[PDB]
Amino acid sequence: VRQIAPGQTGKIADYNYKLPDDFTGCVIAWNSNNLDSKVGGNYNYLYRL
Amino acid sequence: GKLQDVVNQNAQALNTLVKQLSSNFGAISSVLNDILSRLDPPEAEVQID
């Protein structure tokens, strides 16, 4: 979640989507363990390598 | 001497203007190109500024 900020560099901002340096707005995140996590491991969401 | 000072107060005041290009003013390096080599954009701008 730390990776979502303007000007950063990492496995998401480099290849998934980049926030512009002049970006204005807000970022919101919250807990979804009970819904998006299942016993055994969820492979539903991909990312780039 | 009166004319010799006119020439000497110009060349001396001109050399120091060029000589000011080799100072840092607080930046990591005086030369601009080496700043871009080992710095990402969003942190190099504050050094360039």
Curated annotation (Swiss-Prot), chain A:
Changing L46Q: In strain: Omicron/BA.2.12.1. Changing G40S: In strain: Omicron/BA.1, Omicron/BA.2.75, Omicron/XBB.1.5, Omicron/EG.5.1. Changing L46R: Increased resistance to neutralizing antibodies. Decreases HLA binding to NF9 epitope. Increased binding affinity to human ACE2. Changing Y47F: In strain: B.1.1.298. Residues 42-49 are annotated as: Immunodominant HLA epitope recognized by the CD8+. Attaches the virion to the cell membrane by interacting with host receptor, initiating the infection. The major receptor is host ACE2. When S2/S2' has been cleaved, binding to the receptor triggers direct fusion at the cell membrane. When S2/S2' has not been cleaved, binding to the receptor results in internalization of the virus by endocytosis using host TFRC and GRM2 and leading to fusion of the virion membrane with the host endosomal membrane. Alternatively, may use NRP1/NRP2 and integrin as entry receptors. Binds to host ACE2. RBD also interacts with the N-linked glycan on 'Asn-90' of ACE2. Cleavage of S generates a polybasic C-terminal sequence on S1 that binds to host Neuropilin-1 (NRP1) and Neuropilin-2 (NRP2) receptors. Interacts with host integrin alpha-5/beta-1 (ITGA5:ITGB1) and with ACE2 in complex with integrin alpha-5/beta-1 (ITGA5:ITGB1). May interact via cytoplasmic c-terminus with M protein. May interact (via N-terminus) with host bilirubin and biliverdin, thereby preventing antibody binding to the SARS-CoV-2 spike NTD via an allosteric mechanism. This is Spike protein S1. The chain holds residues 407 to 455 of 1273 of the full protein.
